[PDB]
Amino acid sequence: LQRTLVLIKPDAFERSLVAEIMGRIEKKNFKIVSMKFWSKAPRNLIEQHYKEHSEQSYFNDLCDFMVSGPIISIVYEGTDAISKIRRLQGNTNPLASAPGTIRGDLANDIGENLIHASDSEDSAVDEISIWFP
Amino acid sequence: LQRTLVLIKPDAFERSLVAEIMGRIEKKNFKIVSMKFWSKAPRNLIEQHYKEHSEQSYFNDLCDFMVSGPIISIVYEGTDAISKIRRLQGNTNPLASAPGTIRGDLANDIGENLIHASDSEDSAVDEISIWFP
Amino acid sequence: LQRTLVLIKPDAFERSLVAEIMGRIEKKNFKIVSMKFWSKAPRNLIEQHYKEHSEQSYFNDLCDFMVSGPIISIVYEGTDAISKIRRLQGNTNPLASAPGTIRGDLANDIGENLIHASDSEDSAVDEISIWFP
Amino acid sequence: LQRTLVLIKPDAFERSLVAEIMGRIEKKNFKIVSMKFWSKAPRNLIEQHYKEHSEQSYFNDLCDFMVSGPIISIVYEGTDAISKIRRLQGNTNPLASAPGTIRGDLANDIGENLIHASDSEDSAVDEISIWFP
Amino acid sequence: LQRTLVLIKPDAFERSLVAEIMGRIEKKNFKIVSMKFWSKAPRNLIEQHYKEHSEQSYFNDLCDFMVSGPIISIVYEGTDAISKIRRLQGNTNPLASAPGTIRGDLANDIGENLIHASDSEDSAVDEISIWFP
Amino acid sequence: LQRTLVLIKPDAFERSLVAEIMGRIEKKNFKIVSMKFWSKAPRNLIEQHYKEHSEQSYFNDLCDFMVSGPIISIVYEGTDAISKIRRLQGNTNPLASAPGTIRGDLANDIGENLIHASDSEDSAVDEISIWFP
Numbered sequence: 001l002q003r004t005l006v007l008i009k010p011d012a013f014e015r016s017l018v019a020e021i022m023g024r025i026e027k028k029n030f031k032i033v034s035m036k037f038w039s040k041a042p043r044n045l046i047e048q049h050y051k052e053h054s055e056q057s058y059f060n061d062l063c064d065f066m067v068s069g070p071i072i073s074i075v076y077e078g079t080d081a082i083s084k085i086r087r088l089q090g091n092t093n094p095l096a097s098a099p100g101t102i103r104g105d106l107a108n109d110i111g112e113n114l115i116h117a118s119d120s121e122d123s124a125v126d127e128i129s130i131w132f133p
Numbered sequence: 134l135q136r137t138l139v140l141i142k143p144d145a146f147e148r149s150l151v152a153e154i155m156g157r158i159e160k161k162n163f164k165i166v167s168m169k170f171w172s173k174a175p176r177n178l179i180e181q182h183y184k185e186h187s188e189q190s191y192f193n194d195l196c197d198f199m200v201s202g203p204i205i206s207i208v209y210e211g212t213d214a215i216s217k218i219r220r221l222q223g224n225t226n227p228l229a230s231a232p233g234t235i236r237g238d239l240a241n242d243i244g245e246n247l248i249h250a251s252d253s254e255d256s257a258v259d260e261i262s263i264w265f266p
Numbered sequence: 267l268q269r270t271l272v273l274i275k276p277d278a279f280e281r282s283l284v285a286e287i288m289g290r291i292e293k294k295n296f297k298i299v300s301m302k303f304w305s306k307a308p309r310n311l312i313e314q315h316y317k318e319h320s321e322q323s324y325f326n327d328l329c330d331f332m333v334s335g336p337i338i339s340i341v342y343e344g345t346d347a348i349s350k351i352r353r354l355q356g357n358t359n360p361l362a363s364a365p366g367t368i369r370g371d372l373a374n375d376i377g378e379n380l381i382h383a384s385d386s387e388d389s390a391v392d393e394i395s396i397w398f399p
Numbered sequence: 400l401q402r403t404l405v406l407i408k409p410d411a412f413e414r415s416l417v418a419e420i421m422g423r424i425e426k427k428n429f430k431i432v433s434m435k436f437w438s439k440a441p442r443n444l445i446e447q448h449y450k451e452h453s454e455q456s457y458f459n460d461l462c463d464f465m466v467s468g469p470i471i472s473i474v475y476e477g478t479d480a481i482s483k484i485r486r487l488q489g490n491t492n493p494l495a496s497a498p499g500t501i502r503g504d505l506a507n508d509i510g511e512n513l514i515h516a517s518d519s520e521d522s523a524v525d526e527i528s529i530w531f532p
Numbered sequence: 533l534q535r536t537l538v539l540i541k542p543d544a545f546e547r548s549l550v551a552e553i554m555g556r557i558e559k560k561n562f563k564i565v566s567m568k569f570w571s572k573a574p575r576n577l578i579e580q581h582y583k584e585h586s587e588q589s590y591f592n593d594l595c596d597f598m599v600s601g602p603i604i605s606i607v608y609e610g611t612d613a614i615s616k617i618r619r620l621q622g623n624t625n626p627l628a629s630a631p632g633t634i635r636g637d638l639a640n641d642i643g644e645n646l647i648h649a650s651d652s653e654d655s656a657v658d659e660i661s662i663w664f665p
Numbered sequence: 666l667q668r669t670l671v672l673i674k675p676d677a678f679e680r681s682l683v684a685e686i687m688g689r690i691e692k693k694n695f696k697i698v699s700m701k702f703w704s705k706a707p708r709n710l711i712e713q714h715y716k717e718h719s720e721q722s723y724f725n726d727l728c729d730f731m732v733s734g735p736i737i738s739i740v741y742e743g744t745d746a747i748s749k750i751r752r753l754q755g756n757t758n759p760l761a762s763a764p765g766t767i768r769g770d771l772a773n774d775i776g777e778n779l780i781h782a783s784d785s786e787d788s789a790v791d792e793i794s795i796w797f798p
């Protein structure tokens with residue numbers, strides 16, 4: 001029914017949490033449709049991915065972070081996959097992310113937060129085309 | 134103090150999640166008082182269990198599902214066991230079930246949702262008598 | 267395709283390791299074909315089960331232990347299930363049971379050793395007829 | 400940025416949940432700054448720790464409980480560590496503690512609830528000085 | 533420092549064990565240097581990969597199985613990675629694979645055995661050039 | 666009933682495996698009788714602990730590593746605790762440590778190997794007096 005774009009971020013690799021994160025999505029019965037490993041993502045790709053954040057004070061630090069180690073980009077498929085994976089992901093802010101969520105259990109920074117997931121049907125299409133042209 | 138009726142549903146067997154589900158209840162320190170394995174539950178038993186749903190459009194599909202593989206029926210005992218296990222179970226709807234709950238972590242369908250737990254003292258008594266006459 | 271008889275012993279209930287043990291077998295892709303919960307196993311069934319030990323110095327303590335809490339009797343089905351589950355179980359002696367096995371990881375006593383598994387085709391048939399006549 | 404005081408309570412030792420609890424805090428990327436194992440904490444220490452509860456009907460039972468087995472006292476450090484660990488801990492009341500939290504997943508009593516964490520900056524300072532003078 | 537080629541086989545996807553298998557390797561501190569997801573591996577790549585088996589009785593079934601679902605091809609890097617991952621993998625024969633190994637804990641069939649790993653430096657070079665030319 | 670001395674080494678803190686290692690021992694039903702956290706172990710204690718290695722080529726690197734981060738010193742108690750925990754620990758050489766063991770599953774270096782355990786009754790007495798005089 002729906003396809004969403006997930007990024008396993010460089011901090012997941014540094015902290016050896018790649019399997020842990022992918023395992024939480026896998027156990028929810030979401031199916032991998034496409035996947036790519038990036039040893040270092042091109043900065044331009046990152047900048048496109050986060051285009052809506054270009055005027056934010058953290059934009060450059062964010063881009064630096066996202067190129068600092070490997071990323072895995074994954075297209076997951078399932079009924080209402082976009083909203084469901086967003087709820088598994090958890091809130092951006094470590095003051096709010098709920099225990100039981102990926103970020104709530106594992107992330108302790110607003111920036112180094114392990115995982116990206118598309119937030120809407122519109123943005124899922126855009127992001128899938130970025131990472132899987 | 135309280136006794137509640139839990140069903141491990143056929144999807145749990147298919148997806149090899151029986152131990153995972155029982156383990157979550159066990160780690161919460163609830164005690165098994167009775168347990169029965171059903172290779173295939175009798176349809177009539179299922180129909181009685183879900184009698185309140187007989188006029189629903191999904192009733193037949195639900196009954197078909199519940200006889201499609203094995204079920205384990207368990208009576209768990211503990212202080213406020215009925216409400217506590219309901220909260221561990223999670224919401225029926227995969228749009229609502231919270232990460233950290235059984236359904237929130239593991240279920241991705243409104244129908245194939247791994248687990249039944251009694252919703253009240255009144256229904257616990259009824260269901261216990263159905264599965265353990 | 268073989269059937270084997272497994273008992274989850276009273277120490278597993280005491281230490282809340284029931285799901286942990288069943289999980290290890292389930293993950294190995296073995297299927298439950300029968301299962302019974304015993305709040306307290308009748309002494310005669312225990313003495314029949316361990317009849318080969320009836321003249322050993324530890325027989326009375328063994329029987330006492332086996333009726334000291336609940337047990338689950340499970341028939342598991344799989345290709346070469348008997349030997350495979352015996353290998354998962356691990357050695358009776360905690361000085362010999364290998365890490366990775368159920369007893370090697372979890373048990374620390376020659377007597378309170380969490381799990382029984384049939385040791386041959388013939389003993390399997392006998393034990394199945396005892397717990398599931 | 401912040402330091403908070405955690406107690407692993409005697410029930411965690413009895414139920415073999417020490418690692419499980421510490422593991423949840425560790426995976427959130429909080430750093431141990433100080434740690435002490437108490438075979439049995441002095442009653443006076445407990446009474447100081449829970450001074451605000453001296454006029455409560457459960458005070459004596461609580462103190463009895465807290466000296467009934469070992470405690471580990473830990474100072475954890477991290478950005479907003481006090482509130483973050485409180486959220487991981489979960490509500491005191493087993494009717495309210497959320498699945499995904501330490502208490503929500505593992506505790507089933509209002510009193511025997513596995514873990515203490517400081518509730519404010521003010522109380523963190525007081526408790527750290529009690530356990531680590 | 534060596535590179536080895538690992539395949540996550542179609543049975544791992546069917547049984548939702550992809551993260552479980554990758555997790556065991558990740559926890560051993562091995563680093564992904566390349567990775568590809570194959571919705572369906574092309575038959576020619578499979579037949580090249582298993583070319584040494586082309587005249588065996590099981591070749592056709594093997595190839596059929598290997599294209600029956602998705603696979604992930606991973607190049608892992610680490611000191612003595614080849615032999616170390618082979619030891620984690622465990623024996624092909626489910627009567628021989630040790631508990632603690634990937635196959636020993638998880639696989640129950642000589643053919644559907646979850647994971648491939650290069651068996652030598654030379655076979656590693658060959659397999660890497662096949663999946664990552 | 667024996668007591669053994671365990672050290673959780675600095676690589677365990679770096680890789681966030683402290684609870685994982687302690688968990689494996691706790692699950693084997695061993696009891697903590699003493700424990701100390703060392704933000705940085707004093708060099709003299711390290712050199713005393715590894716005094717048998719003082720003339721080895723790796724002594725300086727070993728000592729450097731052992732003071733490069735925090736360590737926990739634990740005295741564990743159990744029947745045949747010394748040999749049993751040594752078997753859980755696994756071989757020093759990552760080419761020899763068996764899957765299922767702590768080092769076999771988690772360590773990938775001869776030097777950064779996560780855990781020390783006393784190797785005999787006599788070395789246990791010596792190490793206990795060093796870390797807990």
Ligand SMILES: Nc1nc2c(ncn2[C@@H]2O[C@H](COP(=O)(O)OP(=O)(O)O)[C@@H](O)[C@H]2O)c(=O)[nH]1
Pocket residue numbers: 053058062091092110111112113115116117119
């Ligand atoms: N330092 C910092 N980084 C931020 C902040 N807000 C967002 N970011 C970074 O920008 C990324 C995108 O932000 P957003 O779409 O709002 O959050 P997400 O969808 O939860 O990842 C986040 O993953 C953060 O790493 C902030 O307030 N401070």
Ligand SMILES: Nc1nc2c(ncn2[C@@H]2O[C@H](COP(=O)(O)OP(=O)(O)O)[C@@H](O)[C@H]2O)c(=O)[nH]1
Pocket residue numbers: 186191195224225243244245246248249250252
């Ligand atoms: N397909 C479908 N099935 C439903 C729906 N509502 C309930 N069911 C099924 O009927 C069962 C009983 O419903 P209910 O008592 O409301 O939910 P539960 O107590 O959370 O299991 C559920 O477990 C579902 O499998 C629905 O809207 N659609």
Ligand SMILES: Nc1nc2c(ncn2[C@@H]2O[C@H](COP(=O)(O)OP(=O)(O)O)[C@@H](O)[C@H]2O)c(=O)[nH]1
Pocket residue numbers: 319324328357358376377378379381382383385
């Ligand atoms: N105390 C004691 N108990 C024993 C001994 N040998 C066997 N037992 C007990 O008797 C049970 C059956 O023994 P056996 O069939 O040889 O071992 P198992 O198949 O590995 O459980 C074991 O599970 C032990 O609990 C012994 O030497 N000492």
Ligand SMILES: Nc1nc2c(ncn2[C@@H]2O[C@H](COP(=O)(O)OP(=O)(O)O)[C@@H](O)[C@H]2O)c(=O)[nH]1
Pocket residue numbers: 452457461490491509510511512514515516518
């Ligand atoms: N029996 C009982 N014990 C309580 C109650 N409220 C608090 N306690 C105990 O007193 C301790 C301190 O209470 P409090 O600071 O409010 O809760 P906490 O910070 O969540 O541990 C708790 O951990 C409980 O063990 C109660 O209503 N009944």
Ligand SMILES: Nc1nc2c(ncn2[C@@H]2O[C@H](COP(=O)(O)OP(=O)(O)O)[C@@H](O)[C@H]2O)c(=O)[nH]1
Pocket residue numbers: 585590594623624642643644645647648649651
């Ligand atoms: N049915 C069957 N399949 C086999 C046999 N031997 C090998 N295979 C299959 O061929 C694949 C490659 O064999 P091999 O290189 O010897 O084993 P591996 O490196 O442990 O996977 C194995 O993974 C099996 O799936 C056999 O005797 N019978």
Ligand SMILES: Nc1nc2c(ncn2[C@@H]2O[C@H](COP(=O)(O)OP(=O)(O)O)[C@@H](O)[C@H]2O)c(=O)[nH]1
Pocket residue numbers: 718723727756757775776777778780781782784
């Ligand atoms: N680099 C290096 N370090 C070693 C060697 N042998 C021992 N060590 C280090 O010295 C420590 C003590 O050695 P030993 O008592 O033999 O091994 P252990 O009891 O298994 O830790 C080990 O944990 C290693 O970190 C070696 O051959 N090379």
Ligand SMILES: [Mg+2]
Pocket residue numbers: 117118119
């Ligand atoms: Mg976003």
Ligand SMILES: [Mg+2]
Pocket residue numbers: 250251252
């Ligand atoms: Mg209901």
Ligand SMILES: [Mg+2]
Pocket residue numbers: 383385
């Ligand atoms: Mg036997």
Ligand SMILES: [Mg+2]
Pocket residue numbers: 516517518
């Ligand atoms: Mg408080």
Ligand SMILES: [Mg+2]
Pocket residue numbers: 649651
């Ligand atoms: Mg091979």
Ligand SMILES: [Mg+2]
Pocket residue numbers: 782784
């Ligand atoms: Mg040594």
